Amino acid sequence: MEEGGRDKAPVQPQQSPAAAPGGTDEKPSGKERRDAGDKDKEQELSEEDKQLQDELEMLVERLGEKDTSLYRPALEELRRQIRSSTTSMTSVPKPLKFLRPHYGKLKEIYENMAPGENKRFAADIISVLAMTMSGERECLKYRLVGSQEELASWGHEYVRHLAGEVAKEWQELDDAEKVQREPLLTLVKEIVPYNMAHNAEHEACDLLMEIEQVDMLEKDIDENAYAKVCLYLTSCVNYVPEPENSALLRCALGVFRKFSRFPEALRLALMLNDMELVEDIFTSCKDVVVQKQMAFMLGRHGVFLELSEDVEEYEDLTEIMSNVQLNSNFLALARELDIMEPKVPDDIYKTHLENNRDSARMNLASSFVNGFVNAAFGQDKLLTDDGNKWLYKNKDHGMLSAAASLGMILLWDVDGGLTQIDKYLYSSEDYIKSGALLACGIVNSGVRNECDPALALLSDYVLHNSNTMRLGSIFGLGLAYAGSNREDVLTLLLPVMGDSKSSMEVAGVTALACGMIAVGSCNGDVTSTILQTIMEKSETELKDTYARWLPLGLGLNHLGKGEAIEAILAALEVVSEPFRSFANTLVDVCAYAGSGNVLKVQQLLHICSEHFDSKEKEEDKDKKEKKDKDKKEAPADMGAHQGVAVLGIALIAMGEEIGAEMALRTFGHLLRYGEPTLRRAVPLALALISVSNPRLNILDTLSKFSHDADPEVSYNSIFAMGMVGSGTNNARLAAMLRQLAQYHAKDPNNLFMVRLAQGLTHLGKGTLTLCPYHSDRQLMSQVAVAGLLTVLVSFLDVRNIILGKSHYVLYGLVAAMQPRMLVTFDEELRPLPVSVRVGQAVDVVGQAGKPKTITGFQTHTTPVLLAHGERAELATEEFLP
Amino acid sequence: ASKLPLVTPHTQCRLKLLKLERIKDYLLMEEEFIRNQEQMKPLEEKQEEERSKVDDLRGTPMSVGTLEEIIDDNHAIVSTSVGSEHYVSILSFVDKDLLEPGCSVLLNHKVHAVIGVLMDDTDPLVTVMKVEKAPQETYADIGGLDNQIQEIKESVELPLTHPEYYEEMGIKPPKGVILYGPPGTGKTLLAKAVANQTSATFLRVVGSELIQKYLGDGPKLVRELFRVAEEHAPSIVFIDEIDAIGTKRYDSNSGGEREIQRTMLELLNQLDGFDSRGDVKVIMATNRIETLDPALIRPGRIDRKIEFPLPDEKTKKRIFQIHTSRMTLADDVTLDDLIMAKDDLSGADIKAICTEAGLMALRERRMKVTNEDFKKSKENVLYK
Amino acid sequence: TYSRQIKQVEDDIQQLLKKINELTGIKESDTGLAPPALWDLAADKQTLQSEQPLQVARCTKIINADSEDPKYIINVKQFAKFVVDLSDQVAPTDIEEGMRVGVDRNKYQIHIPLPPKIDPTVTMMQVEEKPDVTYSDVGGCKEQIEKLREVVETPLLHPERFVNLGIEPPKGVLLFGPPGTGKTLCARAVANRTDACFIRVIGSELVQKYVGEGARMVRELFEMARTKKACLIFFDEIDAIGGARFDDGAGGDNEVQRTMLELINQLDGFDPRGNIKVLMATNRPDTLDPALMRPGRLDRKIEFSLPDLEGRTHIFKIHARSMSVERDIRFELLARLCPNSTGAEIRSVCTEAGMFAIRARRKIATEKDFLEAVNKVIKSYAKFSATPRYMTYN
Numbered sequence A: 001m002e003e004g005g006r007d008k009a010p011v012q013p014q015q016s017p018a019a020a021p022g023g024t025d026e027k028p029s030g031k032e033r034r035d036a037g038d039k040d041k042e043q044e045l046s047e048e049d050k051q052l053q054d055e056l057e058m059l060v061e062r063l064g065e066k067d068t069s070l071y072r073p074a075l076e077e078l079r080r081q082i083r084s085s086t087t088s089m090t091s092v093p094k095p096l097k098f099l100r101p102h103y104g105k106l107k108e109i110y111e112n113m114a115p116g117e118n119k120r121f122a123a124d125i126i127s128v129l130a131m132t133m134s135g136e137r138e139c140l141k142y143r144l145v146g147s148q149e150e151l152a153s154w155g156h157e158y159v160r161h162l163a164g165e166v167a168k169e170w171q172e173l174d175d176a177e178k179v180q181r182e183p184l185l186t187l188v189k190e191i192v193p194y195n196m197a198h199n200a201e202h203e204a205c206d207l208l209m210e211i212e213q214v215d216m217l218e219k220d221i222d223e224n225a226y227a228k229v230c231l232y233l234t235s236c237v238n239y240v241p242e243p244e245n246s247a248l249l250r251c252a253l254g255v256f257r258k259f260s261r262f263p264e265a266l267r268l269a270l271m272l273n274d275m276e277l278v279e280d281i282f283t284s285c286k287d288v289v290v291q292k293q294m295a296f297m298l299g300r301h302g303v304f305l306e307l308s309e310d311v312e313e314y315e316d317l318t319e320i321m322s323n324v325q326l327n328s329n330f331l332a333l334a335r336e337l338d339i340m341e342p343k344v345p346d347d348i349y350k351t352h353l354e355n356n357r358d359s360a361r362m363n364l365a366s367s368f369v370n371g372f373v374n375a376a377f378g379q380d381k382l383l384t385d386d387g388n389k390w391l392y393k394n395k396d397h398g399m400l401s402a403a404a405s406l407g408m409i410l411l412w413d414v415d416g417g418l419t420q421i422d423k424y425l426y427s428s429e430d431y432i433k434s435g436a437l438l439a440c441g442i443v444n445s446g447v448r449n450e451c452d453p454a455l456a457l458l459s460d461y462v463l464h465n466s467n468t469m470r471l472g473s474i475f476g477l478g479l480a481y482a483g484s485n486r487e488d489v490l491t492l493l494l495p496v497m498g499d500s501k502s503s504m505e506v507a508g509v510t511a512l513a514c515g516m517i518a519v520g521s522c523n524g525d526v527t528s529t530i531l532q533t534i535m536e537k538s539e540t541e542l543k544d545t546y547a548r549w550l551p552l553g554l555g556l557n558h559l560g561k562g563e564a565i566e567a568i569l570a571a572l573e574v575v576s577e578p579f580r581s582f583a584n585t586l587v588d589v590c591a592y593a594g595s596g597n598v599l600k601v602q603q604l605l606h607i608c609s610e611h612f613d614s615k616e617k618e619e620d621k622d623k624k625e626k627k628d629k630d631k632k633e634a635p636a637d638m639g640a641h642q643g644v645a646v647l648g649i650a651l652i653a654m655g656e657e658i659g660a661e662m663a664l665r666t667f668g669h670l671l672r673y674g675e676p677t678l679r680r681a682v683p684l685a686l687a688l689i690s691v692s693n694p695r696l697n698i699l700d701t702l703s704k705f706s707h708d709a710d711p712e713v714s715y716n717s718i719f720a721m722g723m724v725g726s727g728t729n730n731a732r733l734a735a736m737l738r739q740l741a742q743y744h745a746k747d748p749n750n751l752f753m754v755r756l757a758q759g760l761t762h763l764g765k766g767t768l769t770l771c772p773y774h775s776d777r778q779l780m781s782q783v784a785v786a787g788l789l790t791v792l793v794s795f796l797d798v799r800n801i802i803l804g805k806s807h808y809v810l811y812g813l814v815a816a817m818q819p820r821m822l823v824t825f826d827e828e829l830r831p832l833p834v835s836v837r838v839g840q841a842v843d844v845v846g847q848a849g850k851p852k853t854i855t856g857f858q859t860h861t862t863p864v865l866l867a868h869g870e871r872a873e874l875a876t877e878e879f880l881p
Numbered sequence B: 001a002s003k004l005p006l007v008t009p010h011t012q013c014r015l016k017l018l019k020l021e022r023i024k025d026y027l028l029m030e031e032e033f034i035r036n037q038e039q040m041k042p043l044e045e046k047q048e049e050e051r052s053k054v055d056d057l058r059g060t061p062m063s064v065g066t067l068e069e070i071i072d073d074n075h076a077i078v079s080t081s082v083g084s085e086h087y088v089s090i091l092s093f094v095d096k097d098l099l100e101p102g103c104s105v106l107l108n109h110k111v112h113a114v115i116g117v118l119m120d121d122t123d124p125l126v127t128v129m130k131v132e133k134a135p136q137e138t139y140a141d142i143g144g145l146d147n148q149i150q151e152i153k154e155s156v157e158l159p160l161t162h163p164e165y166y167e168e169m170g171i172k173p174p175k176g177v178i179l180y181g182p183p184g185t186g187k188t189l190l191a192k193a194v195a196n197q198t199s200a201t202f203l204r205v206v207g208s209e210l211i212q213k214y215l216g217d218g219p220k221l222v223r224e225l226f227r228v229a230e231e232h233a234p235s236i237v238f239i240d241e242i243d244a245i246g247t248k249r250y251d252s253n254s255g256g257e258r259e260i261q262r263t264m265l266e267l268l269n270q271l272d273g274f275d276s277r278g279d280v281k282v283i284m285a286t287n288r289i290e291t292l293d294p295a296l297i298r299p300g301r302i303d304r305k306i307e308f309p310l311p312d313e314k315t316k317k318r319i320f321q322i323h324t325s326r327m328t329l330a331d332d333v334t335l336d337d338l339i340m341a342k343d344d345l346s347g348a349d350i351k352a353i354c355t356e357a358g359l360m361a362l363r364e365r366r367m368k369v370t371n372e373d374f375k376k377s378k379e380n381v382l383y384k
Numbered sequence C: 001t002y003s004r005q006i007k008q009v010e011d012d013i014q015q016l017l018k019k020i021n022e023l024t025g026i027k028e029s030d031t032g033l034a035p036p037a038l039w040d041l042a043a044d045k046q047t048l049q050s051e052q053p054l055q056v057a058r059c060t061k062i063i064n065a066d067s068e069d070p071k072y073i074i075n076v077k078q079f080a081k082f083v084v085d086l087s088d089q090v091a092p093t094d095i096e097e098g099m100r101v102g103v104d105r106n107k108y109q110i111h112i113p114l115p116p117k118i119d120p121t122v123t124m125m126q127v128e129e130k131p132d133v134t135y136s137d138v139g140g141c142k143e144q145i146e147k148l149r150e151v152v153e154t155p156l157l158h159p160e161r162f163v164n165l166g167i168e169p170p171k172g173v174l175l176f177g178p179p180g181t182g183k184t185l186c187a188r189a190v191a192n193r194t195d196a197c198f199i200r201v202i203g204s205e206l207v208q209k210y211v212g213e214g215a216r217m218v219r220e221l222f223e224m225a226r227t228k229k230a231c232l233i234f235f236d237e238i239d240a241i242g243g244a245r246f247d248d249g250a251g252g253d254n255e256v257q258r259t260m261l262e263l264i265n266q267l268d269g270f271d272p273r274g275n276i277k278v279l280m281a282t283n284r285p286d287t288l289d290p291a292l293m294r295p296g297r298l299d300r301k302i303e304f305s306l307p308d309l310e311g312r313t314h315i316f317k318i319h320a321r322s323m324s325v326e327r328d329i330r331f332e333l334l335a336r337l338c339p340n341s342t343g344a345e346i347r348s349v350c351t352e353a354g355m356f357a358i359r360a361r362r363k364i365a366t367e368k369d370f371l372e373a374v375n376k377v378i379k380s381y382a383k384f385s386a387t388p389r390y391m392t393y394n
C-alpha cells in the first residue's frame, strides 16, 4: 500500500476543520469560505452512488469529529449563513460517524434546524445520504415522540413535510422496487396513526404514476394479510380509495373489500356497494361483481339492487337471483355430462375384483355410493333399487338418510325437485317425510326462491308433536336460507327452540339451523338461547349433546368479528361453574375465524396445557384444542406449518386424551389440499391399530383420512386399508367409514369445492355449513341416533371447481387460455416471474386446477377483471396492429 | 428444519420482520409447552433413562444378517451369516423405514430379533470411476477451436447454470453429445476442460474395459454404472473410445461376438429405456465413427455431433505460442520455419517437438534453446 | 437499517430452536435408532411381552406326510432331517406337502405355514410405480393404438360382453418397426393406464453366467405371475433372447436356445398360463424363431410404419404446442419438406429451432429458425441415419 502525496482529502479537508477553531474568531471571511468549499467538495464527492467509501465522508471524523463537537454546540453565535453549510453537511456523515447506538443523538446536528432544501443534493441518492437518516429519525426519535407526545415541538411539525418530500423523491430517480421501500418509512412514521399518513400520501400517489400504483396495491394486500387490530382497521380502510383515485380499475374494489366489510364496519360495505352502483358505466364490471355476491364471497345482497331503472343493468340482480343459477345448472348439464360424465358411474366399490386374490349397515354406505357420484343433476330412474327396497325394512335413521340423500343427488335445482320428491313423499312414515323434506330443502339450496319458505316445511313443523317430521323439518329450510338474513323465518323458528318442549334433539338442531342464518344483529335469539341453556344445563350433568349444539348457534350468531366486545359480553353474560362454563371457549374463539391473534393463541394454552388431566375437564381441553384448530385455514401460508409442527411435537408425541383421541381432527380443518407430509403422518398414525386407546377414536381419524377431494394416484393406498379392514377393524363400526372415505375421494368427480378460500384469501362464509360436521364428529359412537342423517348432507356447501369459461353476452367463445402454476411474485425486480409451469396450454372449460393460475393470449388483455372473479368475461379487443 | 422458505422479501421489509417475530413467538411457546412436562411430570430423566433402558434391552454383542422378506406386522425372515434363516420379530425402536431387501441388519445374540439396521460401506467401483479434483486449466488453454466450445457450453453448462432461458421458451435441453475426428486433435482435452469447470460429479470410463471374460458380466457392469451415476446427483457420464469394442477382439472373452451384441443392447436400453431417466448427461467420443451401430446414435439418444478438423496454420501459430509461453526461448529461433515442417501435422506433434527439444537442451545442463535443438528434435519425433 | 437487530434476532431464535431440539433429543449419533418420541411405547410391555412369549421359530421345508394319524418328515439346509408332528393350534388340512413351515427350536414341531421363494432379482421386476405419458401424446398412429387397446385393456374392464358372446380373446401381441417409431412409448402409455400388475422384463437380463439359470428365472417369473388374479408381462428387445436353432460344428449359442425353449413351453402345452397376457416389441423381426411366431402365442402382429403426411403435421402440433412462437407459422410446409422421417427427428427439429432462437437474443422464434433447423438436422446429419438399412429389416 502507498500513503501520502495523493492523500489530499485527509490533509486539506482535515486541516481546514482543524484550523476552524482558530478561524472561528477574528476571521469572518474564511469561516464562510472554507465551510462552503468543504460542503461543495463533499457534496460533489457524495453525489455518485458508487463510491460509497468517500475520501471525505470517512476521513473527516478522525480529527474533525471533536472539531464538530466544539463547532455546532460550542459556538453560541450561529448566523444565518454558516448554519446552512454546517448542519446540512454534518448531517450526512454523522449516521456512520459514531458507534452503533447513534439513533439517540441526532438532535445535536440535524433536529436543531433543517437548512433550506437539503433535498437538492440528496435527490441523486437513494438510500445513503439522508433518507437513511430520515428513516433513523422516524425509527426511534419520532417513534418516542409520537408514542405519547404527538403534540410536541419541531420534531413533529415540519418533520412530516420532510418525510413527505423524501417519500415523493423515492419514486423520482429510478422508480425501482424502492417504491415498496416508501411504505417502510410510511409505516414506521406514525404506525398506529397510519390513517392521516395514507391520506397525505394518497394525493401524492395519484399524481405520481399510473403504472406505479398496481404494484403498490399488491404490496398493500400483501401487508393486509396480517396487522395489529388498529393497524388492520387503518390500513384496510386506507387501501380502499387506491384503485379508484389513482387507478381506474373500478372492478377490483368489491372483490377486495371483503377484508374491509366485517372488520371495518358493515356501513362501509353498504357505502362501497352504493359507490359500485354509482359507477355503472361499464355495465359489465357490475355484472361480474354481482355474479359472486350470494354464495361465493358474501350473501344477503339482494336488498340493495332494486332501484328505479331495473331493466337490464340494475335488473341484473334478478338474473343473479335464479337465472344465473339455471345457467350454471345448464353449464353443468352441457359441459360435464356431454363430455366425460355418465349418468350413473356407481362403481368405485365395484372394483373389488382385485381383492379376492352381509349386514344391512353396509347398505347405508351403498346410498353414499349413489348420492356422491350422482351430484349435479345425476338423477337416476330405477337405479335406486337398493334405496327403494331398503327404505321400508330396517334402519329408520338410515332410511331417513337415504331419503334425504336424493336431495344432494339433485344439487342446485329449482325446476322439479319437489315433483320428484312427491313420488316417495306420500307414504305416512315416521322418517320418509322428514327425509324427503330435508332433501327438498337441499335441492333449492342457494336458489332462495319462493319454493317453500313457510308453505311446505312449516306445514310439517306446525305439527311438532312427532319424533320425526318435526325435527326433520328445520335442517333443510335452514340450509336453503343459510345465506339470507330474513327475519320472518327467524321469528317463525324462534318459538320452535323457545317451545320448552320435551324435544331435546329438535331444539338442538333448531339452534344449529337458526345460527347458520344470521351472523349479525337480533340479540333476542342470543337472549333466548342463553336463557334456555341456563334453565336446562344448570340443573344437570348429562352428556354433551346440548354442549355441541346450543353454543354453536351463538358462535354462528357471533362469527367473524375482531372487535372482541361481543366475546367479552358473551363471556360475562354466562359466567358460571366450569361445567356450566363449557361455552367460555366457544364464543370467544368463534369471533376469530380468520385473523392474527398469536397472543390469544398462546393464552389459549396458558390457562391449562395438560394439568395431568385427572378425568376432570377432558371436554374442556378437547374443545379448547378444537377452537385452537382455527387460524390455520387462511394463515397466509405462514402459521399453518408452525401449527402442524406444534401439533406433531406436542399432541401426538406425548399426551393423555387430547393427543391420542381427537388430535388428528385438526387436519380436517387444516387443509384439504393434500400434501405427502400429512399424507404420511396420517397413515403412520392410522396403519397401526393400538387397541390400547379408545379404538373408535382412531376409526374417526380414518373417517377424515380422505377429507381431501380431487382424486389422485395414491387412492390404491386406501384400498390396501380395506384389506386390513377385512379381518381387523370389525365392519360393524368401520364398514360405512371405509366406504364413505373411499368414495369421498372421487365424490367430487371433476366438480370440487371444499376449501373455503376464493380469489386471494377471502374465505367466503362456508364455515357456517362446515363447522357442524367437525363439532358433531367428536364421538363417532353416537352415529346410531342419526349418524347417517347428519353426515348425509352436512357438507351441502359445495360450489364446484368449474369457474373459468366465457360468460359472454352471446357466450359463443368456448375457451382460449393457458394454464400454469400459482402466480405470486415478490418485488425483487420490477419485471416479474411467478408461474414455473408454462408447459401446459389447453383451450377447454374443464377443471381449473387447485394450485393453478390461468392466463390468456391472442391479444385479449382481459379488460373485464384482470385480477380475480373466477367468472372472467373475456372481453375482446385488437388495438395492436 | 426447513421451517419457512418464504423469505423472498430478503430485506428490512416489515413483512419479513413480522414473520420472523411470529416464528420466534411460536418457537418460544412450543418450547415452554415441551419443557413444562419435564418440570411438572418428569417420571424419568428421558435424556438418558430411556437410552439406558434401550442399551439394557439389547445385548452387548449383536450380529449382522441379511433380510430376505418382510411381513407388514413387524416380523421378517432374516438369513444368518452361516446361511440358516429364521422367523424373528421386529422391535419398535428400529425406525422401520430403511427396511429393504438385502440390507445388513443388527440382530440380537439370543433370540435373533431385529434390533437395528446398518449403513453400508461404499463400494470398490465408486472409487475406481469417481473423479476427485479438477485436472487443469479451463478453456483458456485450448485455442484454435473456439467454435464447438460454445456448442458444448450450450449442452452441459448452460442447462445447469441458468435454467431460466429454457423455461421461458419451454423446451428441454439437447440430450446427447458425441465428438468425432482424426486422432490427436483435442477431444479428451475439451473433456478435461469441462471437468475442471463443472460442478456435478464426473464419471469417466474407457470403452476397452466394457468387455469382460465371463457370460453376462457386461450387462451387469453397465447396469451398475448407470445405477451409481443415478443415485448421487446431477452428474456427467463420459465414455471414451467406444469403437474399441467393435474393432479389436480378444481370446480372453468367453463368448464370441454375440455377447458384444448383448452388451450393445443393454447400453441402448440404458440410454433410452422406458424408465424415467432422471438427470444424467452423456458425452461420447471416438475417431472411427463409420463402424458403430446407427441405432446407437439416432436422435433421442445422441442429439449433437461435433467434428474436430485438422488444425490450420493460424491455429498452428497459436498453438506454438501457447506451448512455449514459459520456456526460456532464445531470440534466434522462429516459429514460421517450423510451421510447415510437416504438411499436415496435428496438435500432439507440437507438444512432442517442444518437450523433446526441452529434454535435449536439458542434457547439456543449459537453459536456452537453440535452432539445432529444434532441428534435431523434429527428425527425432517425426522421421522413423 | 436495523439489520444488526433483525440478523441477531434470527440467529438467536435459530440457536434457541437448535437448543430445544437437542433438549428433545436428536444428538448421540444413531446407528439405526428411531426418534425418542416414537418408540416410547416399547418401554414396559414390549420389553417383557414381545420377548419371551415369542421364539425364533426356525424355517423348514416339508417333504412328505405319513398317512392317517400323521407323522411328518422335515428338512433344513444344514441341520438334519426329522420325523415330527403338529401342535394343537394348526389344522391338518392346510399343510400340503412342499411348502415351507415354522418349527420350534427344541421339540421340533410344526407351527405355521409360509409363502415360497421369489428370488429377489426377480422380485425387482415389478414396476410398482407408473410413468406419466398418456394416449393423447402418441399422435400419428391411431389405428395401431386402437388395435392394441381392444386386446390389452378392454377385456379386463368389461369381462361380460365376451363371456356372453362365447368368444375367447387373444392373449399375445407383437410390435415391430424401424427405430425411433413409438413402440416403447406406446408401452409406457399402456402401463400408465392399466390397473393390474405390470411386470417389465428386458431381454438382455436373461443372460446368466452359469448353466441352467435363465430357465429358472423364467419359471419363477411365471409362478409369481400366477400368484395374482390377472396381470401383464412386458418383454422388451426380444431379438436378444432367441433367433433360431441352427447348431452346427462346435456347439455355439446353445444355452440361450434352452432358455428360449423354456419360454416357449411356459406359454403353450398342458394347461397354459390361463389369465396372463404378454406383450413383446422388437426391432428386426426377421431373425425370430418360427416356433415362437406361431399364433396362440403371438396372436397379433401390429406394425409401426413411418408417418405419411398427416402424422407429421400432427406430431409437429403435439411437440410445439408449449413454446413461445410467432402467430403465423405454417407447419404443413415443414411436413412437406421431410418426406421419410420419424417422430424423433421431428422432436429434434423443434428443440433445435428453440435453441437457435435462444442463441442470439430473442424471446419468440420465427419461421426462419424452423427452416434453418430443418436444413441442419435433416439434410446435414444425413450421413448418420438408420432408416435406409432398417426398412429392409437387416
Ligand SMILES: Nc1ncnc2c1ncn2[C@@H]1O[C@H](COP(=O)(O)OP(=O)(O)OP(=O)(O)O)[C@@H](O)[C@H]1O
Pocket: B141, B142, B143, B144, B145, B182, B183, B184, B185, B186, B187, B188, B189, B190, B287, B319, B346, B347, B348, B349, B351
Ligand atoms: N487444439 C489444441 N489446443 C491445444 N493443445 C492441443 C490441441 N490439439 C492437441 N493438443 C495437444 O495434443 C495433446 C493431445 O490431446 P488429446 O489426447 O486430448 O487429443 P485427442 O485428439 O482427443 O486424442 P485421442 O483421439 O487420441 O483420444 C493435448 O494434450 C495437447 O497437448
Ligand SMILES: Nc1ncnc2c1ncn2[C@@H]1O[C@H](COP(=O)(O)OP(=O)(O)OP(=O)(O)O)[C@@H](O)[C@H]1O
Pocket: B272, B295, B300, C137, C138, C139, C140, C141, C178, C179, C180, C181, C182, C183, C184, C185, C186, C282, C283, C315, C318, C342, C343, C344, C345, C347
Ligand atoms: N407417434 C408419435 N407421437 C409422438 N411422439 C412420438 C411418436 N413417435 C415417436 N415419438 C417421439 O420420438 C421418440 C421415440 O422413441 P421411442 O422410445 O418411442 O422409440 P422406440 O420405438 O422404443 O425405439 P427403438 O426400438 O429404436 O429403441 C420419443 O422421443 C417420442 O416422444
Ligand SMILES: [Mg+2]
Pocket: B187, B188, B240
Ligand atoms: Mg482421447
Ligand SMILES: [Mg+2]
Pocket: B272, B273, B274, C183, C184
Ligand atoms: Mg425402446
